[model samples]
Target chain A: IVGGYTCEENSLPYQVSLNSGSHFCGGSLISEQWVVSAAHCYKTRIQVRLGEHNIKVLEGNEQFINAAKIIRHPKYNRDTLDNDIMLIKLSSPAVINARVSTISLPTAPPAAGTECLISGWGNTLSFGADYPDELKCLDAPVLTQAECKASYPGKITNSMFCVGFLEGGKDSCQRDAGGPVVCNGQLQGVVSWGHGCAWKNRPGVYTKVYNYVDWIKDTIAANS
Target chain B: IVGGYTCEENSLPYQVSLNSGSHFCGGSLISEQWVVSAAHCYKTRIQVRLGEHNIKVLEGNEQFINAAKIIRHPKYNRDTLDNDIMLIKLSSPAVINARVSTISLPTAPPAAGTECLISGWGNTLSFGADYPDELKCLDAPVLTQAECKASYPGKITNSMFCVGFLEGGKDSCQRDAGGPVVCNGQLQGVVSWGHGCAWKNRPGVYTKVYNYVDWIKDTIAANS
Candidate 1:
């Protein structure tokens, strides 16, 4: 996350590292064997590592698990980044422990002005910046859909939501796609895309997790 | 976690499952890569799962990760059970998400009579009872140190506190050690030992997280 600082190591236990070969995107553990990420991150050879904080060091708590399957939202749009959510099933159920865990999906929409957090190992600069070894966390307040609509015009969809600082300093950036926007400890959004990293008035857009709860459950059950 | 019902699946994002080849205890995510649990649960091959609610089914949100290191309290005692807190460092840092996140460690003890939530996959019945598939959660009220000492007489220490119902129908039971005793979304205690599950006047005991915050930070810095 650009304009964010390194998160305290070993925090954010649900953050996921999505690797096609190397780190390609971020994701969240929603259950023991499933990961919810951006549908745009769909790849053929995606592997997931959890409980990881610093990519530079080999932390003993890292679990390098394989994705048995990957299912993207059926109507996901590449051009518009709409319905951007996806799920990856692990080959085996994860062994539960302290450093590793899942996060909860929100039961309702987060209120505007609610303080939320977004974290990832994405670029720390707007363009061509190096991804940090440590994960980053930034505080963002939810903006109204109307405010968001003012920025994106007709691009805003019911399946999408927006969060940002009006001052334009912090947001999910390159390689942070499919990560989480957590508000009050509940999953509300997935880092989808933006005009640029922390661009003025162009708040970061996320796939609304609340709108696709049914699709998520149905997909997981059908695949299981 | 006895006498509890299944949680809403993704309600408690910071709750963790600790496993030593199988389910043994529970924990809470306190940071991106750190978990605070009971020191007595120290064991080899410990794995942590995040964003998990059920032990039996492989939920889509579960993040099975590795524990890079374990640090038990220096003064932890098996016989006396003093200073039972422990910190586990994740091999990788967790991503913050709705289904998986970290809870705040308390700055001070919760007020007496404050209701809290305790969760785990422990036995629903007393001694030697079967463990549950779905994670169990129960509401418990904080008890005065005086009231707790009255039950265990001289066993209660400053580093530890107590929580449960005087009515004796709800409590943390076997297999729940190392889990979280959360009040008002702040972590107040660890699920430590108890005389028995929900026995009359024998409320569950916990290692006070507030008492050990300095030690936790020092250990993490020293180890890092």
Candidate 2:
């Protein structure tokens, strides 16, 4: 319904059958012909597979589309974590169907505490050792600015964001690396990283969607 | 209870005693050793008060500790925000009491949507205001990867993170920089930036702790 479901965790969301284990995290469905993902994912000849529910979909090789151009964010910071987001335009526009539809983009973010959904073939939980089967998704609410500042007195900044459970049972694990954090049917956050999978003191963080909306649209417009 | 008593929302966790009201955002404890804070706090020479909430503790300024060595992240990029995390080895470790103790490092992170806490002694809810009297903190949650990808699909990366409510009533206001994002007792993200004082549709972004663990350890080790 939210269009967050993919096929597996830790793998490409759009490309359900590219490779069994490749490091493709966050991805966006651009036009019918393209799926936008991170540039770093393209560094090692990244592949894509779209519209499959099972991991073996790649083996069946029946329903999948390969990627065309993998565009990394112009200001990606592999070392500094600054420009960590990217885009991927598919070789052909993905056929929009019941199973593979696109999520709407919000010019502004949804209200705080709004529960959003995200799905992909990535890790189901934080610190997970392996990838998950079936597109998995997780939810998190946004924290107040005062609340965010109260957590860590060191590294948080304007360009960053925070979210997680209070009980400390859930979190975005490894392989869930470049995933998304959706809110109320709209996209809001990204599955970036934390200390490990669901530690007590650490909260899962993301890049604020609204903060960089202009950049995302402008970049895509210029590139397209 | 936690090591420190948390205050209300939109309040600063710590204060600047030296300038009588210069203003600061980040601070940390290295065990009973001492309370380490930003170098900019002292402007060269470090002098700080731990127990009392208000800078008025300046009365017995003798109770404060000075910097043994103020070390900024070697690769600190003022222009960008690379290596912005800093440390100040205390002249002597403070007595580990209820007043001062080391905040735990995140061994793992909690699930996305988990609640985290942050503390600081920054400006008031709005800008151009006087500093808070005591350390202020607030509660917030973690974000998801899909949400992140959808928001800034091009710029969000594996290393970046986000935090704060999507509705956006509260946020880290002035004087709440260089702080922490703690969840489940583990240190996860760090406060980086925001659009304005808890502005709507505007949450805060943070440094992804998992990505920089090795860097933090290596940096601290190299310094020591």
Local distance difference test scores for all models: 0.86, 0.54
Q: What share of the true interface contacts does each candidate keep?
A: 0.00, 0.00
DockQ scores for all predicted structures: 0.01, 0.04
lDDT of 2 by residue, B1-224 (tens): 01224474222222222322354556555344433333233356655445545544443322467657666655544544433455566676665544444666667643578887766666555445656666667687777765543443333434446676766655565556656677776667656655565555556656555555565566557656
What lDDT score is found at residue A125 in candidate 2?
A: 43
RMSD of each predicted structure: 26.0, 15.2
Predicted structure 2: lDDT: 0.54
TM-score (chain A) of candidate 1? 0.97
